[PDB]
Design a protein around this ligand. Sequence first.
Ligand code: SAH
Length: 352
Amino acid sequence: PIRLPNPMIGFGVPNEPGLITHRSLPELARGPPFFYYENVALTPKGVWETISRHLFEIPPEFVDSKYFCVAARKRGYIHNLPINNRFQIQPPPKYTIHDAFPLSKRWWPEWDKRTKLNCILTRTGSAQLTNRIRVALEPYNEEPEPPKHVQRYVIDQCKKWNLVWVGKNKAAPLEPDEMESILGFPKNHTRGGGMSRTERFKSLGNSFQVDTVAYHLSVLKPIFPHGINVLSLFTGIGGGEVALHRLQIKMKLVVSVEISKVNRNILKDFWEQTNQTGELIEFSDIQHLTNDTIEGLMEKYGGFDLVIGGSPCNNLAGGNRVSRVGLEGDQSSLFFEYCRILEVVRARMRGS
DNA sequence: TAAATTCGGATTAGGAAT
DNA sequence: ATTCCTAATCCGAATTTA
Ligand SMILES: Nc1ncnc2c1ncn2[C@@H]1O[C@H](CSCC[C@H](N)C(=O)O)[C@@H](O)[C@H]1O
């Protein structure tokens, strides 16, 4: 049974001990293409063992993004990239709550000892929870500190719902632009394209932490001095694309597969606003992308150097009350479509 | 009717006690 | 073993707003 590393540093993270410069991959895992697969680390039992079984028995690299920003993000990455001489994109985001939320020291209690936030999700705290916390605290405003039991309730709720102190006895969730920034996207990346505030919350919650992914992908920069062709599966708001952009790795071509219209609009807006000279091709449903469409695209553009994606985690995530049925859930079973498309790419690039 | 809102525990792992 | 705690966690369904 796969056991999560503690600390969850993968093969090493910046500013920490334990950097590992070499691993040995099964020969079946050898590129081309390079691939990069992502999903949540905290799955039902047996999930990552199965995912590794279908990705050539590559052990996952489990990394918590608290080593890259202020918010935790425990993810598993199966990839066949070299792991020596990674570098981080600069400047790295703010590391602590104090620096990431400069105004918050005005409102932050002595007895809230947090210095990191927890994982950014698709559901945030309600206005009613903020009220319940405010009401619980006011009877003690003239006293220097509320009793220990009301303290622990507020702490337990601030952690459960990833709240920050914004006003007098006011603990509120993160705003979309704060999530964007902590996830390493440029400001306003997800505003526009027809995307509602509600949809911004959801797409940000599902996304990559760009600095974590970029640090992994940085080894590609010396390999491809002339840029890469990219097959982006479950593209989302384009975390993998923003990472390559921040790495100054030219994207000659990106074939993107993303079923959300507003997500595809966010990616096209990014493509135009950053003045990408390459070509963006947008597909919608991965289940309707045929093997021979892939093969035709590779014949036209010369194959794919990188296949990157993160299949849905709906049915794996601990926040799902209703349908956390594991890897064969209606959404998460799309992992096997990632595998199907990846095998088509491998068939052309490496043979058999 | 798009958008916003609020509510709803279980699965894991680990540490510390038996 | 068990027992008992703390602890984190890319969420769905239903309803209400505007
Ligand atoms: N059938 C399907 N075909 C293509 N994409 C799908 C799909 N079903 C779900 N998806 C998409 O898969 C994505 C998984 S979330 C991954 C997002 C990405 N890592 C980022 O940087 O944002 C979601 O955006 C979801 O819309």
